[PDB]
Design a protein around this ligand. Structure first.
Ligand SMILES: Nc1ncnc2c1ncn2[C@@H]1O[C@H](COP(=O)(O)OP(=O)(O)O)[C@@H](O)[C@H]1O
Ligand SMILES: Nc1ncnc2c1ncn2[C@@H]1O[C@H](COP(=O)(O)OP(=O)(O)O)[C@@H](O)[C@H]1O
Lengths: 712, 321, 205
């Protein structure tokens, strides 16, 4: 009773925990009341309780600082005991931990402790360890004396003292600067998958010791360098308490025959001795490359030794082996057989939201100027991974450091805390760093949730509903898992696929003609398997195959060469579709502008069973298109979009966009010329209409209508 | 939550408010039939838009006879008139008001039908002195519904250190098969929910489940002298009513102070915000501190500020256990 | 029963791995008695363009290896080969020569008596109410395939189950469940596809 399971914090503050409101009502405590938390080894911590809309009814959310003071870990249970008798303190003596005060001097109270406690009314108990961030350092302090005992609330009238040498960290105390779950930004889903597979056999080993069924023996994390493959493995080990053993290809391969295999098997023996433990093997493709690529005895023998060590995990109870590679197909396939490394997770590249979270993590200790906008930075840093955003923040800090330290002129072994306290990184310093930084993952495909919404698509009211029904029905109540769009170009085929992904918060995988053509041209259609595997890993996602006939057209289309409607890539796509179930949360959308030359296999039952015609917009839709295209710009009241729509009878949505874009360009040119007008005027649209033409002829519409009636 | 009935002084719960006030209004007819019918029209009828139209239409009938008191066609108000039926006849208490201010309910032959119609006919006694109806018209139009006032239930408490003394069983930290299986199922379901491909409508159906639980709050204030001040507020109540509540409880109601919210945000007396907008609902603790200007004079004079609340409330202090 | 699908024949051609054809026929030899079923025999002709393609015939590496294995397979191994295609007009004629798949059977959409038989067969696992008119359904579903008639019966079963479960929060499938099922079921084979198949069958005399 009155006990909850410890979960992750949402509020990063070190003096507060969050409960679900129904438990605060049973405990008869109010938001802001001070409570004690009872942990292991007869230890306790004092904190303030609030509530939110996300905490589970049976869990308590607290951050790493609180868990370390209680000597508990995620998944444990603690008791909650309100303590309204807590009074305000008179004198509290706080000293820093030596491990975090090195190379820095000056008055730590004025920089750290004073603003941290000033008017904060944080509960404090003797023996507490807490973290104060600032000055580009993370400095934690321990409380050694309190006039009231054993806990109190700091007040503006409380004396805060700090006299004496820094405290040497005790062997039972963990550093708060060690990587944990709060240091991982994007790829939240992938981290959750690792938790499901790994935390249980490590936190509750008895569940797997009493049975003949072993937990997963190995997890292969793959993706570009700098995405957090090692960070996840370390964070999981550090949060659960399992011993972390670091192995990497170069460390083993650099050793001579005999010594190499000895070191590899020795690490496995140590993991058993220190079980539960996680063995992380980085650059798996370097320690275990495909055998057919070399004649060296060392490379083959190391693979054989790793294979036997993985199989020996049935005896090395509570040891889990994780490995990192760039791609799952770059490693010796023997490792991926039943057991061993038969489970893999695609880490991928952080999206705009994940990149912002990563930047916020790296700035934990950084003083930012009021003009710094990390969301804008995250939007511009396309193609960057966490390793590059870490460099970005460091370079921005170094530029700010040079600007001010060249004025400080302090040549010594330490830097005064006041000097670091006044140092701030401004937008000019991030802008400079952005110009110098170069993304490491710019060539790799970036898959994220699109920003196209339904308000960006004019007309097609029935198609919007149809797509929502196709996705919503299998969730609210054989449903189809794909649709083909056909009709004239420039009517919104791509936008429809993005908009449904947007509303679902699903990842959008954009495959265009040039990508289908590249696979055909280079005889690398095997990559289709990786594409469909990405669609599964990216689930929920919408897998969009645009220009399905791009290869048939490249090979002749209307005339033809050695082929016809089918090709290397389409046939591999057909192969993979047969292996994807409706329960994989992947919706496959195709598009073509020439349905008469497309491999008909794609429309056979079990594949793209839905077939939607996208005609040219009608009069009311053309007005909606014009309004959508101009939704982002000032437009004068004299602009008559309904009259324009009446005239542009043969224009597609793409053609109406050209008119809007020309009018926008003209408004910009006029404004610039006047400065050397503030809104788009009818004169700009009347000029635009002089150059815009319809791209879809009347004969092409008949071609599409005939196909529609042929298939019904 | 407790309320005081404005017509009786009785202590009621949130559900008992209408039953007691309605009975008090029906009994009030023995003292002042006009005041009782005015309260009945506004209090019994939940649809206040119709009540406002009803009393305005009644005011027009009264002014019509006031303009032409010598013309008999304005002395009788037809209960079957289209405007009377929609605005007046649909409300409870409107018939009692007409009788209370000197109208008799009679049946008169219609100008075009055999069936007699219902009229309110003003008597000669009241028609001779329009000043009586003019006063009753304003008494109805200026009225409001009768609703029980929220009882603050002002209390001060002293926490007992004994409530914080408890030791756990040795097996406290050993989780059961149901607790471990439930936690692993929640991990698998959390990964599955992140994997599900669903539309916004399905997402909202789950999120919307947390939206309807509370409309009142209990506030506590932690005072420098170790006492806790508690009271009851409506979710839409303004921050100024909390400052007024505390001022009444303080030994010196005029001495400037500030109240700090549990999230670190200071609440100013001049900020007219609702408690459900500041994050103080369904419950919150506020931190009390005196203004710095008076604290400097208190310290400089050598005065220990050892009393925050008035002895009138402290003499009834309860312990928390 | 060994199920071989078009995607296997397509991959073998593009990946230059026709040796997998031998594995298929070798498995049939080892699995005997067995029936070796080659679906989507048109996939090879389609891989060469199908509807467009070049100016040549349907002969290619994969079909040549398949035909070679067929000629080397004896009926004394108790292995029988069955093929299927939805585009018989583009099947390499070599596979229809004596010693290969020389026998041709046309499988049209079920007729009036067959559609009733299909609807009845799908319901042998569940009680059917006396108000259910299966002949009326068969008369309406003139353009439906056996696969589509199965969805109608199976959907009506699910609807009856749904009601049964709700009644405890029924003993048989009622006419209302079949009429409701008809609101979702659709024909998978269009009129233009039917004419294509009938014209081919007529061409063969
Ligand atoms: N997803 C991520 N979230 C947060 N930080 C990340 C992420 N990916 C990488 N980083 C940061 O980039 C660096 C990764 O370096 P390293 O430890 O070698 O890991 P890896 O090279 O395997 O990504 C660390 O500073 C880490 O904080
Ligand atoms: N239905 C529509 N509503 C609004 N804009 C449209 C519509 N159809 C096309 N457009 C315009 O045409 C441009 C290209 O659309 P897109 O979907 O990429 O065409 P396609 O799918 O043929 O490549 C978009 O930028 C958009 O502004």
């Amino acid at each position: 009773p009155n006990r909850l399971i410890v979960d992750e914090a949402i509020n990063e503050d070190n003096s507060v925990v969050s409960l679900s409101q129904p438990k605060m009502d049973e405990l008869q405590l109010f938001r802001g009341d001070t409570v004690l938390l009872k942990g292991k080894k007869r230890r306790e911590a004092v904190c303030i309780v609030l509530s939110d809309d996300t905490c589970s009814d049976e869990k308590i959310r607290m951050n790493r600082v609180v868990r370390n003071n209680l000597r508990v870990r995620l998944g444990d249970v603690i008791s909650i005991q309100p303590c309204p008798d807590v009074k305000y303190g008179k004198r509290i003596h706080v000293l820093p931990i030596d491990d975090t005060v090195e190379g820095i001097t000056g008055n730590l109270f004025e920089v750290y402790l004073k603003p941290y406690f000033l008017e904060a009314y944080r509960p404090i108990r003797k023996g507490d360890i807490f973290l104060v961030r600032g000055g580009m350092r993370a400095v934690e302090f321990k409380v050694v004396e309190t006039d009231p005992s054993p806990y109190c609330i700091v007040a503006p009238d409380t004396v805060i003292h700090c006299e004496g040498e820094p405290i040497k960290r005790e062997d039972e105390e963990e550093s708060l600067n060690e990587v944990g779950y709060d240091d991982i930004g994007g790829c939240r889903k992938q981290l959750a998958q690792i938790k499901e597979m790994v935390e249980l056999p490590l936190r509750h080993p008895a569940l797997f010791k009493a049975i003949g069924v072993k937990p997963p023996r190995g997890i292969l994390l793959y993706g570009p360098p700098g995405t957090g493959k090692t960070l996840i493995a370390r964070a999981v080990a550090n949060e659960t308490g399992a011993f972390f053993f670091l192995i990497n290809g170069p460390e083993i391969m650099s050793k001579l025959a005999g010594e190499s295999e000895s070191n590899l098997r020795k690490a496995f023996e140590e993991a058993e001795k220190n079980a539960p433990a996680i063995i992380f093997i980085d650059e798996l493709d370097a320690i275990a490359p495909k055998r057919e690529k070399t004649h060296g005895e060392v490379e083959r023998r190391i693979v054989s030794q790793l294979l036997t060590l993985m199989d020996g995990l049935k005896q090395r109870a509570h040891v889990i082996v994780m490995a990192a590679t760039n791609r799952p197909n770059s490693i010796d396939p023997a490792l991926r057989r039943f057991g061993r490394f038969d489970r893999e997770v695609d880490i991928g590249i952080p999206d705009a939201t994940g990149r912002l979270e990563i930047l916020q993590i790296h700035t934990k200790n950084m003083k930012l100027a009021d003009d710094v906008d990390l969301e804008q930075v995250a939007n511009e840093t396309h193609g960057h991974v966490g390793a590059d955003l870490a460099a970005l923040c460091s370079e921005a800090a170094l530029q700010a450091i040079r600007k001010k330290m060249d004025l400080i002129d302090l040549e010594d072994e330490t830097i005064d805390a006041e000097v670091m306290n006044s140092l701030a990184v401004t937008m000019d310093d991030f802008r400079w760093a952005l110009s110098q930084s170069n993304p490491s993952a710019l060539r790799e495909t970036v898959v994220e949730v699109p920003q196209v919404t339904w308000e960006d698509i004019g007309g097609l009211e029935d198609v919007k509903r149809e797509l929502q029904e196709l996705v919503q029905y299998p969730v609210e109540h054989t449903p189809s898992k794909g649709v083909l769009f056909y009709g004239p170009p420039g009517c919104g085929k791509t936008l429809l696929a993005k908009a449904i992904a947007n509303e679902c918060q699903a990842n959008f995988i954009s495959i265009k003609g040039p990508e289908l053509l590249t696979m055909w041209f280079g005889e690398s259609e095997a990559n289709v398997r990786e594409i469909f595997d990405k669609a599964r890993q990216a689930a929920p996602c919408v897998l969009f195959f645009d220009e399905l006939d791009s290869i048939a057209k490249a090979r002749g289309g209307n005339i033809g060469d050695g082929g016809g409607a089918a090709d290397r890539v389409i046939n591999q796509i057909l192969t993979e579709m047969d292996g994807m179930s409706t329960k994989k949360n992947v919706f496959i959308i195709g598009a073509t502008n020439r349905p008469d030359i497309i491999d008909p296999a794609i429309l056979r039952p079990g594949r793209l069973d839905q077939l939607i015609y996208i005609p040219l917009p009608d009069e009311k839709s053309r007005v909606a298109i014009l309004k959508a295209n101009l939704r982002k710009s000032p437009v004068a009241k004299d602009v008559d979009l309904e009259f324009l729509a009446k005239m542009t009878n043969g224009f597609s949505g793409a053609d109406l966009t050209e008119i809007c874009q020309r009018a926008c360009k003209l408004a910009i040119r006029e404004s610039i010329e006047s400065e050397i007008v503030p809104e788009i005027r009818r004169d700009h649209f009347e000029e635009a209409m002089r150059f815009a033409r319809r791209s879809v002829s009347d004969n092409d519409i008949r071609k599409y209508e005939m196909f529609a009636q042929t298939l019904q | 939550v407790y309320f005081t009935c404005p017509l009786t002084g009785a202590t009621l719960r949130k559900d008992q408010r209408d039953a007691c006030i309605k009975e008090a209004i029906l009994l009030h007819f023995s003292t002042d039939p006009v005041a009782a019918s005015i309260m009945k029209i506004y209090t019994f009828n939940k649809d206040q838009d119709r009540v406002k139209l009803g009393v305005d239409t009644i005011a027009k009938y009264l002014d019509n006879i006031h303009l032409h008191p010598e013309e008999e066609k304005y002395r009788k108000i037809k209960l079957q008139n289209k405007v009377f039926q929609e605005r007046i006849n649909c409300l409870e208490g409107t018939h009692e008001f007409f009788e209370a201010i000197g109208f008799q309910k009679v049946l008169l032959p219609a100008q075009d039908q055999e069936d007699p119609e219902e009229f309110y006919v003003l008597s000669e006694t009241t028609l001779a002195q329009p000043q009586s109806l003019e006063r009753h018209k304003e008494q109805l139009l200026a009225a409001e519904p009768v609703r029980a006032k929220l009882d603050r239930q002002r209390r001060v408490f002293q926490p007992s250190p004994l409530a914080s003394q408890f030791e756990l069983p040795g097996d406290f930290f050993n989780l059961t098969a149901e607790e471990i299986k439930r936690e692993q199922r929640l991990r698998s379901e959390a990964v599955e929910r992140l994997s599900v491909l669903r539309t916004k409508a399905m997402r909202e159906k789950e999120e919307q489940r947390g939206l309807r639980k509370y409309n009142y709050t209990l506030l506590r204030v932690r005072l420098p002298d170790g006492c806790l001040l508690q009271g009851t507020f409506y979710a839409r109540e303004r921050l100024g009513a909390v400052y007024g509540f505390v001022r009444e409880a303080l030994q010196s109601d005029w001495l400037p102070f500030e109240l700090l919210a549990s999230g670190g945000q200071k609440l100013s007396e001049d900020e007219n915000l609702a408690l459900n907008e500041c994050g103080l609902v369904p419950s919150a603790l506020l931190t009390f501190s005196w203004d710095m200007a008076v604290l400097e004079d208190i310290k400089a004079a050598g005065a220990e500020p050892d009393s925050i609340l008035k002895p009138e409330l402290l003499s009834a202090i309860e312990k928390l256990l």
